[PDB]
């Protein structure tokens, strides 16, 4: 009553939120689905699969899913092992000499499901995955910022902490201790415990594991170096591989000048911002992971303005010198180019895939009887393939639940 939404049920949040967080799944009917594994992909080809509990754990920490995704329809987020995606695509990753791909596509065509299909590989494939979702959340101008003249890069403490925690929690602890500081590190200390007593912090080279470095507790103007080293340790070493995973990179493929004004009102580039450097450089090749199993998947998504960067960069339009920076950051292009970056234009759904999904969609009764009884089967099938622009997974859902005309 007097307390906001005193009632336990919370819907006051913008519905997109109501869908994101509400613990509504609950009711979802439990379905005994096959498990997503790449080694067993021949058994589950063109079928709806559930992720492993270990996969889900890492995916949740990495935030592999998104609020817009109708993930609330089911007890847990599910996917189809599409063969032009999962199967065929993952093969490129486990086969391409550059392991540097960009999952593009048409909005909704699930360029994100794929990326999450990819963190799925990494969970079982036992690698170390470092997704950096909604980059914007660091180019937004909302989180903290300060300089670091030991690196000439504005750093974003608070933001780094979130990403650092994501990597440590999602990745398998053992799979982490495996990398031992390949050198020395000496930063601050504010661990409530040994804080007012031990002035600074120390990591011995071979008694200290990367898991430890990623568990330090530093004071704001230090977390930055923590990252330099976090990455650097993992980076240089060659024991396990890497998957610098960036979704929505588009935002950073274009909107350079960030949001944070510096100290002369002048705008701060997205490259003078530490995470920008951590983000682009690796993409470029200015930073190399030893392990040849180094993997890099960057992927543009729909919620984001478009511009000449990607298209030109990837070679889909000759360089037009006379354009405008607001739509062609010449640099971002160069970086990609000098990095040999490749594209997996995510293909839409085939008719039978549609059926498939719609079949699973029937199970949990996540449909509407206007078409369950009163329609044969082929009827509807052909229909959604149609009312879905011939292949936008989301449209199918948009056209099978949300729209009660």
């Amino acid at each position: 009553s007097s307390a906001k939404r005193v009632t336990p049920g919370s819907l006051y949040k913008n519905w997109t939120n109501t869908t994101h967080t509400a613990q509504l799944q609950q009711t979802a009917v439990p379905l005994a689905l096959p498990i997503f594994n790449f080694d067993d992909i021949s058994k589950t080809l063109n079928k709806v699969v559930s992720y492993s509990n270990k996969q889900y754990k890492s995916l949740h920490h990495l935030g592999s899913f998104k609020k817009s995704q109708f993930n609330e329809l089911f007890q847990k987020p599910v996917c189809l092992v599409r063969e032009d995606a999962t199967n065929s695509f993952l093969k490129k990753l486990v086969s391409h000499p550059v392991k540097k791909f960009i999952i593009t596509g048409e909005p909704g065509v699930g360029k994100t499901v794929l990326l999450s299909q990819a963190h799925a590989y990494a969970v079982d494939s036992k690698q170390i995955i470092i997704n950096i979702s909604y980059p914007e959340l660091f180019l937004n101008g909302r989180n903290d910022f300060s300089y670091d003249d030991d690196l000439k890069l504005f750093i974003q403490p608070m933001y780094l902490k979130k990403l650092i925690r994501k990597i440590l929690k999602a990745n398998d602890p053992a799979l982490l201790k495996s990398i031992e500081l390949s050198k020395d590190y000496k930063f601050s200390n504010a661990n409530p415990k040994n804080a007012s007593v031990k002035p600074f912090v120390t990591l011995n080279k071979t008694k200290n594991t990367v898991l430890d470095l990623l568990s330090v507790m530093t004071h704001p103007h230090n977390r930055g170096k923590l990252m330099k080293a976090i990455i650097d340790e993992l980076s240089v070493q060659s024991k396990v591989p890497i998957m610098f995973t960036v979704d929505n990179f588009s935002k950073v493929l274009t909107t350079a000048y960030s949001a944070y004004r510096n100290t002369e009102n002048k705008q701060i580039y997205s490259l003078d911002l530490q995470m920008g450097k951590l983000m682009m450089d690796i993409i470029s090749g200015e930073t190399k992971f030893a392990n040849g199993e180094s993997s890099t998947i960057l992927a543009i998504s729909g919620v984001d303005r478009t511009n000449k960067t990607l298209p030109v960069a990837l070679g889909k339009i000759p360089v037009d010198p006379y354009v405008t920076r607001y739509h062609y950051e010449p640099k971002f292009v160069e970086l990609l180019q000098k990095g040999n970056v490749t594209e997996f234009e995510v293909p839409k759904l085939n008719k039978q895939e549609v059926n498939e999904l719609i079949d699973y969609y029937k199970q949990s009764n996540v449909l509407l009887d206007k078409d369950i009884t009163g329609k044969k089967w082929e009827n509807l099938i052909d229909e959604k393939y149609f009312l879905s622009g011939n292949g936008n997974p989301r449209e199918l859902l948009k056209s099978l639940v949300l729209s009660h005309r």
Binding site: R142, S146, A259, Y260, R261, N265
Partner: protein, 120 residues
């Protein structure tokens, strides 16, 4: 949030515009880069201000011209022509369209505020 520059503010209140609000000598663009020099991450609320930081905040407003200090400057610019032979001075002193608006009808506004020390 506290007694910042005396008439302070409240938490949750992003500082950028907050300054444009309470303060009269500063607003909009002025308040924007005012934070920029003090370098506070934008979209930052009052509660987060590290008291010492407010100190800088205060000094900053001292640097430029803020508070009713300028209210007077205009008051004088008004009195100026007013003191000379100035249609305005009449319009301003009588409480009538100083912008030569609708004296005949819509003029209550002028009568309401337009006056010797206008900004009251």
């Amino acid at each position: 949030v506290v007694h910042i520059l005396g008439k302070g503010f409240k938490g949750k209140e992003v500082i950028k515009i907050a300054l444009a609000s309470k303060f009269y000598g500063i607003g909009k663009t002025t308040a924007e880069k005012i934070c920029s020099k003090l370098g506070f991450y934008p979209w930052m609320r009052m509660h987060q201000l590290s008291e010492p930081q407010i100190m800088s905040i205060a000094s900053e407003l001292s640097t430029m011209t803020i508070e009713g200090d300028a209210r007077a400057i205009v008051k004088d610019n008004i009195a100026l022509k007013r003191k000379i032979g100035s249609y305005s001075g009449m319009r301003h002193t009588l409480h009538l369209p100083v912008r030569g608006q609708h004296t005949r009808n819509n003029a209550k506004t002028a009568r309401k505020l337009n006056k010797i020390d206008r900004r009251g």
